[PDB]
A = this chain, B = another copy of it.
Amino acid sequence: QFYYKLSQELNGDMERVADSLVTLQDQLNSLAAVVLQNRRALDLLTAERGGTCLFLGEECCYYVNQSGIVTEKVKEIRDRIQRRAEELR
């Protein structure tokens, strides 16, 4: 009875966490496409100056997309919630 309740409490919290993680990654994917397009525009505008980084006289900053990691963790979390929901039923 207490195992049933706590398992349901954990699943309800984790469902909300998994939805938030997906949404945070979705916004990062959305924002990064705008940022990378902005960089491409800056590289063309400063082409004669060797692009953005040479124009500023700095080391280049590159974006490291790690979306597949968060996608995989969310899939594992959702599998665990589903396995626990089935154990109950």
Residues of chain A at the chain B interface (Cβ within 8 Å): 2-3, 5-7, 9-10, 12-14, 16-17, 19-21, 23-28, 30-42, 44-46, 52-53, 55-56, 58, 60-67, 69-70, 73-74, 76-77, 80, 84
In the bound assembly, the distance between CA atoms of A44 and B56 in angstroms comes to 8
* B30→A64 contact, CB < 8 A: yes
Q: How far is the CB of A78 from chain B (nearest CB, A)?
A: 10
Main secondary structure of the interface of A (DSSP, over half): helix
* B70→A55 contact, CB < 8 A: no
> A55: which B residues are within 8 A, CB to CB?
41, 44
In the bound assembly, the distance between CA atoms of A19 and B75 in angstroms comes to 13
Q: Which listed residue, B2, B12, B41, B69, touches A52 by the CB 8 Å rule?
A: B41
